[PDB]
Amino acid sequence: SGAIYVGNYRVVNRHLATHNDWANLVWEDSSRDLLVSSTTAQGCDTIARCDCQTGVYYCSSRRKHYPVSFSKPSLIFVEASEYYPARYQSHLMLAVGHSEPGDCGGILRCQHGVVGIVSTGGNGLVGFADVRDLLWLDE
Numbered sequence: 001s002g003a004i005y006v007g008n009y010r011v012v013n014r015h016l017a018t019h020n021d022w023a024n025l026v027w028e029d030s031s032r033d034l035l036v037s038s039t040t041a042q043g044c045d046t047i048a049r050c051d052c053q054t055g056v057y058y059c060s061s062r063r064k065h066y067p068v069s070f071s072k073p074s075l076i077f078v079e080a081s082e083y084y085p086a087r088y089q090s091h092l093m094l095a096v097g098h099s100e101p102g103d104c105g106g107i108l109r110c111q112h113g114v115v116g117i118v119s120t121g122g123n124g125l126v127g128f129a130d131v132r133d134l135l136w137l138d139e
Ligand SMILES: CSc1ccccc1CC(=O)N1CCC[C@H](C(N)=O)C1
Pocket: 015, 033, 078, 081, 083, 084, 089, 099, 100, 101, 102, 103, 104, 118, 119, 120, 121, 122, 123
């Protein structure tokens, strides 16, 4: 679990979106595992606008933040699950690090701000859905 709050927006994993998120939908993309919904309050998270490949992520399954080197956003094959069939997920960044299913939503941050959220994992790897290209989150 975990979301990003920026202005009148709530950014969550699409596979964890609530009824409220769907009834207040702004944008969703299954291929990126993202869903953005509207909020009545003003979000204060800053989105990074950069091409950093190092940062820190929050891991709920260890209650700890971990420093990571992560790849550039790209199409990565993700195995079938209760939420999606086996497919390529786009805008995905991989790092070597611990993750478990309940970890989805934890924020990845660099010195410039919020980079993306935990979305995949398996075998000592963690995958982050990038949000830096979503320039409309600030306007
Ligand atoms: C942190 S997720 C994790 C971690 C360790 C092991 C297994 C997982 C589950 C995982 O990778 N997925 C299930 C939820 C939907 C994800 C997707 N974006 O398609 C894929």
